[PDB]
Structure 1
Amino acid sequence: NWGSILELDLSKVPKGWDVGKWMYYARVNHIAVIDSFKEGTIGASTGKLA
């Protein structure tokens, strides 16, 4: 028995931010700034990807 495991995708961590510091400030503030207009979301935003 281990607790629930959350599958987390880092596709929206802002540019120039390391994952570790992003999750740290997410811990401290309980608010994690994301970037809905990353270059990797271009397909989904533009209708080229699902």
Structure 2
Amino acid sequence: NWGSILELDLSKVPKGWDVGKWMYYARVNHIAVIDSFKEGTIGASTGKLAGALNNAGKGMIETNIGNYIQQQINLLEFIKMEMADVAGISKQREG
């Protein structure tokens, strides 16, 4: 289990900016200046390339492992409860 992963495309980081310093100021200010009129966006802007390249948001490598973990925890609670019952020793009777 690792967190969600964001697929980040750097096609709009402004000119003459390193990715490291760009991301560093994005951390600090929570605001990242981008450049919609980069040469790499010319096809999408002029209609020569699919417009999805200037749109569509950012993708996620999300796996639903939390629901699996919750299911296993609930099963553990159920099995411990059932062992307690068959042994004749309730939770209230341990404490």
Whether TM-score is above 0.5 comes out as yes
* Percent identity between the two aligned chains: 98
Structure with the higher helix share, 1 or 2: 2
Q: What does 1:1-50 correspond to in 2, within 5 Å?
A: 1-48=1-48
Q: Which structure carries more strand by proportion? A: 2
Q: CA deviation at 1:16?
A: 0.1
TM-score (norm 1): 0.96
The offset of 1:38, in angstroms, is: 0.1
- Which has the greater radius of gyration? 2
For residues 2-50 of structure 1, what are the alpha-carbon distances to aligned partners after superposition, in whole Å with 9 as ceiling and x for unaligned?
A: 00000000000000000000000000000000000000000000000x9
For residues 2 and 15 of structure 1, the distance between their equivalents in structure 2, rounded to whole angstroms, comes to 33
Stretches of structure 2 that go unaligned for 5 or more consecutive residues are 49-94
SS in 2 for 1:27: helix
Structure 1 segments unaligned to the other structure (5+ residues): none
Q: CA RMSD for the aligned pairs?
A: 9.3
Aligned length: 49
Runs (4+) off by over 3 Å: none
Query: TM-score, structure 2 length as denominator?
Result: 0.50
